[PDB]
Amino acid sequence: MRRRPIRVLSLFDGIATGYLVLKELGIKVGKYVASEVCEESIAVGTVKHEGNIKYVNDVRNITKKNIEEWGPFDLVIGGSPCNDLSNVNPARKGLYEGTGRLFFEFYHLLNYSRPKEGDDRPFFWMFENVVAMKVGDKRDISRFLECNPVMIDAIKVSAAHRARYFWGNLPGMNRPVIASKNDKLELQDCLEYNRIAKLKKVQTITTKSNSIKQGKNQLFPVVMNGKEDVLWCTELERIFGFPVHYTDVSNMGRGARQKLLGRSWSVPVIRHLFAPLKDYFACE
Amino acid sequence: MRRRPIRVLSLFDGIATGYLVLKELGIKVGKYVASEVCEESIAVGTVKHEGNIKYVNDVRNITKKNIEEWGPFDLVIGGSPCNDLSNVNPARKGLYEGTGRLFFEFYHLLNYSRPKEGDDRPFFWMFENVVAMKVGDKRDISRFLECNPVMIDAIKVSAAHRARYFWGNLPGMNRPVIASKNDKLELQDCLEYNRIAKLKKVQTITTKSNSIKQGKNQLFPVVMNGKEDVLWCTELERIFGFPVHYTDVSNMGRGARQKLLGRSWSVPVIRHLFAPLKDYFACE
Amino acid sequence: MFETVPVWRRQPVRVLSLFEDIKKELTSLGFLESGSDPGQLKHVVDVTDTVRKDVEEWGPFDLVYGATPPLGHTCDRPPSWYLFQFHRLLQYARPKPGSPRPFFWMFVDNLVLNKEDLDVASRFLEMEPVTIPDVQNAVRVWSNIPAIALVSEEELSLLAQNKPTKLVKNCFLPLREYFKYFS
Amino acid sequence: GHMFETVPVWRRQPVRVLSLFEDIKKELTSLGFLESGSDPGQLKHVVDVTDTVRKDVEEWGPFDLVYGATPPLGHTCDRPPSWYLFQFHRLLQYARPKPGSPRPFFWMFVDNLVLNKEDLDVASRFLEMEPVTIPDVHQNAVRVWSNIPALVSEEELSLLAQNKQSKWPTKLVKNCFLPLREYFKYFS
DNA sequence: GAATTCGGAAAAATTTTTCCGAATT
DNA sequence: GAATTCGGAAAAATTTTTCCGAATT
Ligand SMILES: Nc1ncnc2c1ncn2[C@@H]1O[C@H](CSCC[C@H](N)C(=O)O)[C@@H](O)[C@H]1O
Ligand SMILES: Nc1ncnc2c1ncn2[C@@H]1O[C@H](CSCC[C@H](N)C(=O)O)[C@@H](O)[C@H]1O
């Protein structure tokens, strides 16, 4: 019949990128339930979205009954913590221990919220994680979600390297990534006034400050007034494609804002992936 | 007959409140020479005003020839450091030692920039400082500027106490301070979403974080989600009347931004003082 | 809850058992018959590359069983691995909602799961476990099989510290009310 | 601080001087600039300037010389040493002739080693010139800023300063004042 | 009256850097 | 085959809190 607003379950929501991208595409959001544990992340989603996100705390306390009452859901998205799967951490604990084993919570709740076989209604889902991960882990995640991932590197639509895997059933996930007119594709596009970018594309940004200085010998990315400098948080926000000051919340400083941004999604990549949904739910 | 843009010498410029208030009133600014030594303040003025401010560093190295070359000037404003004059500092060194004596630099350069007899051209100036200051210091400053100050408390147009002395020759400085329509007169008006103000007006904000917690028993000003909290930097910006994120610059955190804001001017009070200037210079 | 089947309608159970083989333990109670060398039990030990189409072809199944390796055998696999994998293929084996028939599953732990592992198990298998003791050894069982006493964990705690088909068998016997009773 | 043409001898007049903090009244007559017959004396001496307005300086009639000095080294000062500087600058500007009537007009400020070096660059920034260091040889010294057309290294004075702590030497000042002879009357 | 305040030197917290590190690309 | 990376425990800075404190409203 007619278009209805989208109802979203979002696990490991971070700074509510899922909501922001849907809103930026013009999709009416009817319900957005977010599971998230970091108090500063929750402040970002709360304040920047005027209380429209319904927070539900630790993913591991969402019950089978919770999915039924909070649902139905049209979109189930999540990107689990990659601190125990990424190659960066020598103390990685793998897929089955530490925080790696949080993926199975997404697998678990995806299955609770999936419609039954008699229901032909539209249902979409996506799971994101890093590429820098053991082959056995990449295999087992594709075993549980029952499909293979797309690899999209944010470098095609942003000023930063960021190779990520995306599993799911959205329309056109394998299609080519072409940049848009408003995409800040080079570091200079992101920088504030009176600052000079040394490089056009920066290396993958992590939660640490070392990722900002480039290469094997840790060079500063920016020149200002003759001296070298690191990136500012507004500049990080632009590289990721967030609105500037999106993380100017909760008295957070340089390190806290970089941690939130360092672990998030590239907004332009997510917009590309969610864009086919405009034709299934109500628009504004 | 017809007006030209205003030419401004601003000493101890801080975060360029003078320029911002002029721009907000619609006055064409032709030249704004700023003397300022704090690298983060300069970053704010630079960035937020797109290089329109001509920075010239330590006030004590401006020469008689500099005033001739950089001039003529139509407006000479300044608020010198009140850390060796205020009552807060028991180790205050007074008007003639420490940073107190920076006032005489303003006195000195004010007279360099003043037109000579026979020049009937408009010339305006203003000097601001704290009330919490010894009477002998208040007397001598009025001895050197040859006039007595008006006292304007920001509490009439903002959510904070902020009593300061203003010496000068602008039109209507002794007139009544009546609040404007857009003035955020209560703390609730300044706060972010999902936050509750305990009070309506907060005590004078200084560069220290103790000034945020209210009264003799140091109460938190805000309640969020049931727990008590201090003010956020966007909220401080709003109390002072700066645009939000005005100081989201240079990777500064909570402490740095409060220092810049804690020692600055209250924008609404300043606008009221500069507003009579619209009829002497070009408008936009 | 499942209604019980009159004795003339009961059929030989088809069981999928993972990690462990309960083949000739389950014949000892008459659920399988000796002669079906292509029996009604399918045994797999490395599930990591098995697809749903694999389970569907070996199906249908009426019982799905899995267990942790025996306490002592220093495993080459994380203890939760046997849980999550059991969970994955159990969902491949369930009857469709369109055709409800008796269908049971069992998982048992040899005290090879620690307590954060145990809270995952009870969250995924949707129930607390049952602690069945021997008086010294013990196992924990999750299952939807209707079953027929008190121990505190510090005995098991200290037993596990220090370093089993007998206890798993009995609970298999309410399944006699659903399938053929050979021997 | 200006350069002035010199005045023929018959046109010279008795100087009018304003002297602050220290009085050169009975020393400036020794060079013939004042006479002991005057009711007004042509010299005005004030010592607590803090409540002095411009029109006070204007009412005290016109001035040709304006002099101020730091108190003597051996004097426990009740005033911050820079106070005598800023205050002298404050009233000197009240005393200058208007740009519309340029006439010979001179000013002098001298320091008794009572200003330290951060105070010294305030002095030279405000009085628009470095000082001249005038020594006493058999040990004392003063530094003079002035627009009047009139070698020791600083550790000599540095160490001189520190021992001396334990009055005003007019002897050093006076001579600087001479050239003004070319501008005003020279009383016998 | 006692409440207030364009701060600062120590002291106790949080914080931002040295090396770290290896499988996957 | 040399470079890359949704990180972390120690270690060295930096920072954010205790008392501090008094003349002026
Ligand atoms: N047990 C748990 N329940 C819910 N969220 C959790 C969790 N453990 C970790 N998380 C959160 O999972 C997130 C992983 S990073 C994901 C960030 C997100 N993709 C974004 O766009 O910002 C982190 O925010 C972390 O705080
Ligand atoms: N010698 C000097 N020359 C120029 N500025 C100086 C200085 N010494 C201190 N300052 C600056 O003087 C300012 C005093 S606070 C002035 C704040 C300003 N009126 C505003 O609206 O923000 C501070 O910014 C301080 O950095």
PDB file of all heavy atoms in Angstrom, chain B residues 133-153:
ATOM      1  N   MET B 133      38.064  45.645  42.379  1.00  0.00           N
ATOM      2  CA  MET B 133      39.378  46.252  42.279  1.00  0.00           C
ATOM      3  C   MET B 133      39.495  47.356  43.297  1.00  0.00           C
ATOM      4  O   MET B 133      38.510  48.028  43.609  1.00  0.00           O
ATOM      5  CB  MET B 133      39.570  46.795  40.881  1.00  0.00           C
ATOM      6  CG  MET B 133      40.298  48.076  40.717  1.00  0.00           C
ATOM      7  SD  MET B 133      40.059  48.608  39.012  1.00  0.00           S
ATOM      8  CE  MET B 133      38.369  49.112  39.120  1.00  0.00           C
ATOM      9  N   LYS B 134      40.709  47.565  43.801  1.00  0.00           N
ATOM     10  CA  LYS B 134      40.914  48.584  44.828  1.00  0.00           C
ATOM     11  C   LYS B 134      40.463  49.960  44.346  1.00  0.00           C
ATOM     12  O   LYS B 134      40.614  50.313  43.181  1.00  0.00           O
ATOM     13  CB  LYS B 134      42.390  48.631  45.239  1.00  0.00           C
ATOM     14  CG  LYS B 134      42.935  47.289  45.701  1.00  0.00           C
ATOM     15  CD  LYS B 134      44.285  47.402  46.375  1.00  0.00           C
ATOM     16  CE  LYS B 134      45.424  47.274  45.357  1.00  0.00           C
ATOM     17  NZ  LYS B 134      46.763  47.647  45.929  1.00  0.00           N
ATOM     18  N   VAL B 135      39.951  50.767  45.267  1.00  0.00           N
ATOM     19  CA  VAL B 135      39.470  52.102  44.903  1.00  0.00           C
ATOM     20  C   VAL B 135      40.602  52.977  44.362  1.00  0.00           C
ATOM     21  O   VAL B 135      40.401  53.746  43.414  1.00  0.00           O
ATOM     22  CB  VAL B 135      38.770  52.767  46.101  1.00  0.00           C
ATOM     23  CG1 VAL B 135      37.431  52.086  46.354  1.00  0.00           C
ATOM     24  CG2 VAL B 135      39.652  52.680  47.313  1.00  0.00           C
ATOM     25  N   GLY B 136      41.804  52.881  44.937  1.00  0.00           N
ATOM     26  CA  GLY B 136      42.919  53.641  44.386  1.00  0.00           C
ATOM     27  C   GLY B 136      43.209  53.311  42.925  1.00  0.00           C
ATOM     28  O   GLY B 136      43.529  54.195  42.131  1.00  0.00           O
ATOM     29  N   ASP B 137      43.088  52.036  42.546  1.00  0.00           N
ATOM     30  CA  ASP B 137      43.270  51.654  41.147  1.00  0.00           C
ATOM     31  C   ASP B 137      42.147  52.221  40.278  1.00  0.00           C
ATOM     32  O   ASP B 137      42.400  52.775  39.198  1.00  0.00           O
ATOM     33  CB  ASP B 137      43.336  50.125  41.011  1.00  0.00           C
ATOM     34  CG  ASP B 137      44.604  49.492  41.644  1.00  0.00           C
ATOM     35  OD1 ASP B 137      45.601  50.208  41.952  1.00  0.00           O
ATOM     36  OD2 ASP B 137      44.566  48.242  41.838  1.00  0.00           O
ATOM     37  N   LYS B 138      40.891  52.065  40.721  1.00  0.00           N
ATOM     38  CA  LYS B 138      39.775  52.678  40.004  1.00  0.00           C
ATOM     39  C   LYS B 138      39.957  54.187  39.887  1.00  0.00           C
ATOM     40  O   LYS B 138      39.563  54.776  38.876  1.00  0.00           O
ATOM     41  CB  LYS B 138      38.445  52.383  40.708  1.00  0.00           C
ATOM     42  CG  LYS B 138      37.222  52.908  39.957  1.00  0.00           C
ATOM     43  CD  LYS B 138      35.963  53.021  40.806  1.00  0.00           C
ATOM     44  CE  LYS B 138      34.816  53.655  40.015  1.00  0.00           C
ATOM     45  NZ  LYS B 138      33.458  53.413  40.636  1.00  0.00           N
ATOM     46  N   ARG B 139      40.541  54.828  40.901  1.00  0.00           N
ATOM     47  CA  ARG B 139      40.719  56.272  40.834  1.00  0.00           C
ATOM     48  C   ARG B 139      41.792  56.646  39.819  1.00  0.00           C
ATOM     49  O   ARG B 139      41.591  57.534  38.980  1.00  0.00           O
ATOM     50  CB  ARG B 139      41.062  56.831  42.213  1.00  0.00           C
ATOM     51  CG  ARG B 139      41.117  58.337  42.287  1.00  0.00           C
ATOM     52  CD  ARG B 139      42.269  58.807  43.176  1.00  0.00           C
ATOM     53  NE  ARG B 139      43.406  57.892  43.067  1.00  0.00           N
ATOM     54  CZ  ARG B 139      44.064  57.340  44.092  1.00  0.00           C
ATOM     55  NH1 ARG B 139      43.733  57.616  45.353  1.00  0.00           N
ATOM     56  NH2 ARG B 139      45.080  56.515  43.845  1.00  0.00           N
ATOM     57  N   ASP B 140      42.927  55.959  39.857  1.00  0.00           N
ATOM     58  CA  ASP B 140      44.017  56.314  38.961  1.00  0.00           C
ATOM     59  C   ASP B 140      43.670  56.029  37.506  1.00  0.00           C
ATOM     60  O   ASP B 140      44.100  56.767  36.614  1.00  0.00           O
ATOM     61  CB  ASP B 140      45.274  55.564  39.343  1.00  0.00           C
ATOM     62  CG  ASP B 140      45.869  56.071  40.608  1.00  0.00           C
ATOM     63  OD1 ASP B 140      45.638  57.266  40.965  1.00  0.00           O
ATOM     64  OD2 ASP B 140      46.563  55.251  41.237  1.00  0.00           O
ATOM     65  N   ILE B 141      42.955  54.934  37.227  1.00  0.00           N
ATOM     66  CA  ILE B 141      42.564  54.707  35.841  1.00  0.00           C
ATOM     67  C   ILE B 141      41.705  55.859  35.353  1.00  0.00           C
ATOM     68  O   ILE B 141      41.895  56.366  34.245  1.00  0.00           O
ATOM     69  CB  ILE B 141      41.852  53.356  35.674  1.00  0.00           C
ATOM     70  CG1 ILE B 141      42.866  52.233  35.585  1.00  0.00           C
ATOM     71  CG2 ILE B 141      41.049  53.330  34.402  1.00  0.00           C
ATOM     72  CD1 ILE B 141      42.350  50.994  36.179  1.00  0.00           C
ATOM     73  N   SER B 142      40.778  56.330  36.191  1.00  0.00           N
ATOM     74  CA  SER B 142      39.990  57.484  35.786  1.00  0.00           C
ATOM     75  C   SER B 142      40.810  58.761  35.774  1.00  0.00           C
ATOM     76  O   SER B 142      40.348  59.762  35.216  1.00  0.00           O
ATOM     77  CB  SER B 142      38.785  57.706  36.726  1.00  0.00           C
ATOM     78  OG  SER B 142      37.985  56.562  36.952  1.00  0.00           O
ATOM     79  N   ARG B 143      42.017  58.738  36.342  1.00  0.00           N
ATOM     80  CA  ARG B 143      42.900  59.899  36.275  1.00  0.00           C
ATOM     81  C   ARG B 143      43.594  59.975  34.929  1.00  0.00           C
ATOM     82  O   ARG B 143      43.829  61.068  34.415  1.00  0.00           O
ATOM     83  CB  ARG B 143      43.972  59.858  37.372  1.00  0.00           C
ATOM     84  CG  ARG B 143      43.598  60.465  38.701  1.00  0.00           C
ATOM     85  CD  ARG B 143      42.884  61.768  38.516  1.00  0.00           C
ATOM     86  NE  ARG B 143      42.475  62.342  39.795  1.00  0.00           N
ATOM     87  CZ  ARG B 143      41.203  62.491  40.153  1.00  0.00           C
ATOM     88  NH1 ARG B 143      40.245  62.102  39.307  1.00  0.00           N
ATOM     89  NH2 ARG B 143      40.892  63.030  41.334  1.00  0.00           N
ATOM     90  N   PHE B 144      43.949  58.818  34.372  1.00  0.00           N
ATOM     91  CA  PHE B 144      44.705  58.750  33.132  1.00  0.00           C
ATOM     92  C   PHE B 144      43.790  58.871  31.912  1.00  0.00           C
ATOM     93  O   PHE B 144      44.156  59.514  30.925  1.00  0.00           O
ATOM     94  CB  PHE B 144      45.546  57.456  33.124  1.00  0.00           C
ATOM     95  CG  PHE B 144      46.804  57.541  33.980  1.00  0.00           C
ATOM     96  CD1 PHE B 144      46.725  57.681  35.356  1.00  0.00           C
ATOM     97  CD2 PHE B 144      48.052  57.525  33.413  1.00  0.00           C
ATOM     98  CE1 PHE B 144      47.851  57.775  36.118  1.00  0.00           C
ATOM     99  CE2 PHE B 144      49.181  57.657  34.194  1.00  0.00           C
ATOM    100  CZ  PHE B 144      49.071  57.771  35.536  1.00  0.00           C
ATOM    101  N   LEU B 145      42.605  58.269  31.954  1.00  0.00           N
ATOM    102  CA  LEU B 145      41.613  58.429  30.900  1.00  0.00           C
ATOM    103  C   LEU B 145      40.761  59.683  31.089  1.00  0.00           C
ATOM    104  O   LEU B 145      39.925  60.000  30.235  1.00  0.00           O
ATOM    105  CB  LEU B 145      40.736  57.184  30.833  1.00  0.00           C
ATOM    106  CG  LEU B 145      41.455  55.828  30.902  1.00  0.00           C
ATOM    107  CD1 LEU B 145      40.418  54.715  31.048  1.00  0.00           C
ATOM    108  CD2 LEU B 145      42.305  55.570  29.706  1.00  0.00           C
ATOM    109  N   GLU B 146      40.925  60.368  32.210  1.00  0.00           N
ATOM    110  CA  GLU B 146      40.335  61.674  32.414  1.00  0.00           C
ATOM    111  C   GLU B 146      38.825  61.643  32.453  1.00  0.00           C
ATOM    112  O   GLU B 146      38.172  62.568  31.996  1.00  0.00           O
ATOM    113  CB  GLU B 146      40.804  62.629  31.334  1.00  0.00           C
ATOM    114  CG  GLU B 146      42.312  62.779  31.268  1.00  0.00           C
ATOM    115  CD  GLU B 146      42.709  63.906  30.361  1.00  0.00           C
ATOM    116  OE1 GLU B 146      42.652  65.078  30.836  1.00  0.00           O
ATOM    117  OE2 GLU B 146      43.036  63.597  29.176  1.00  0.00           O
ATOM    118  N   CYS B 147      38.249  60.569  32.963  1.00  0.00           N
ATOM    119  CA  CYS B 147      36.807  60.467  33.036  1.00  0.00           C
ATOM    120  C   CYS B 147      36.439  59.297  33.932  1.00  0.00           C
ATOM    121  O   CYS B 147      37.278  58.462  34.247  1.00  0.00           O
ATOM    122  CB  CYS B 147      36.216  60.260  31.633  1.00  0.00           C
ATOM    123  SG  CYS B 147      36.585  58.641  30.917  1.00  0.00           S
ATOM    124  N   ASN B 148      35.249  59.305  34.402  1.00  0.00           N
ATOM    125  CA  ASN B 148      34.783  58.230  35.260  1.00  0.00           C
ATOM    126  C   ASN B 148      34.045  57.164  34.457  1.00  0.00           C
ATOM    127  O   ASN B 148      33.513  57.443  33.374  1.00  0.00           O
ATOM    128  CB  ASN B 148      33.845  58.774  36.324  1.00  0.00           C
ATOM    129  CG  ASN B 148      34.548  59.658  37.314  1.00  0.00           C
ATOM    130  OD1 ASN B 148      35.580  59.298  37.888  1.00  0.00           O
ATOM    131  ND2 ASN B 148      34.000  60.832  37.519  1.00  0.00           N
ATOM    132  N   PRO B 149      33.970  55.931  34.957  1.00  0.00           N
ATOM    133  CA  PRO B 149      33.340  54.863  34.189  1.00  0.00           C
ATOM    134  C   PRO B 149      31.861  54.734  34.504  1.00  0.00           C
ATOM    135  O   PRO B 149      31.363  55.205  35.527  1.00  0.00           O
ATOM    136  CB  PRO B 149      34.099  53.627  34.672  1.00  0.00           C
ATOM    137  CG  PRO B 149      34.368  53.930  36.086  1.00  0.00           C
ATOM    138  CD  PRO B 149      34.527  55.409  36.219  1.00  0.00           C
ATOM    139  N   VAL B 150      31.182  54.132  33.597  1.00  0.00           N
ATOM    140  CA  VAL B 150      29.870  53.560  33.854  1.00  0.00           C
ATOM    141  C   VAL B 150      30.072  52.115  34.292  1.00  0.00           C
ATOM    142  O   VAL B 150      31.016  51.448  33.871  1.00  0.00           O
ATOM    143  CB  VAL B 150      28.972  53.655  32.608  1.00  0.00           C
ATOM    144  CG1 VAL B 150      29.323  52.536  31.664  1.00  0.00           C
ATOM    145  CG2 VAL B 150      27.503  53.557  33.008  1.00  0.00           C
ATOM    146  N   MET B 151      29.114  51.614  35.060  1.00  0.00           N
ATOM    147  CA  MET B 151      29.144  50.224  35.465  1.00  0.00           C
ATOM    148  C   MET B 151      27.928  49.513  34.870  1.00  0.00           C
ATOM    149  O   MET B 151      26.785  49.866  35.163  1.00  0.00           O
ATOM    150  CB  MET B 151      29.134  50.107  36.989  1.00  0.00           C
ATOM    151  CG  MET B 151      29.372  48.697  37.505  1.00  0.00           C
ATOM    152  SD  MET B 151      27.982  47.595  37.183  1.00  0.00           S
ATOM    153  CE  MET B 151      27.149  47.630  38.768  1.00  0.00           C
ATOM    154  N   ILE B 152      28.186  48.512  34.035  1.00  0.00           N
ATOM    155  CA  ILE B 152      27.139  47.696  33.430  1.00  0.00           C
ATOM    156  C   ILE B 152      27.349  46.253  33.888  1.00  0.00           C
ATOM    157  O   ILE B 152      28.455  45.720  33.764  1.00  0.00           O
ATOM    158  CB  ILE B 152      27.150  47.794  31.902  1.00  0.00           C
ATOM    159  CG1 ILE B 152      26.937  49.241  31.449  1.00  0.00           C
ATOM    160  CG2 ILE B 152      26.106  46.900  31.315  1.00  0.00           C
ATOM    161  CD1 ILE B 152      27.165  49.444  29.925  1.00  0.00           C
ATOM    162  N   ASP B 153      26.312  45.651  34.481  1.00  0.00           N
ATOM    163  CA  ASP B 153      26.323  44.242  34.859  1.00  0.00           C
ATOM    164  C   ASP B 153      25.619  43.425  33.790  1.00  0.00           C
ATOM    165  O   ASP B 153      24.468  43.700  33.463  1.00  0.00           O
ATOM    166  CB  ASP B 153      25.651  44.018  36.217  1.00  0.00           C
ATOM    167  CG  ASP B 153      25.849  42.597  36.746  1.00  0.00           C
ATOM    168  OD1 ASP B 153      25.849  41.651  35.930  1.00  0.00           O
ATOM    169  OD2 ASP B 153      25.986  42.411  37.975  1.00  0.00           O
TER     170      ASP B 153
END
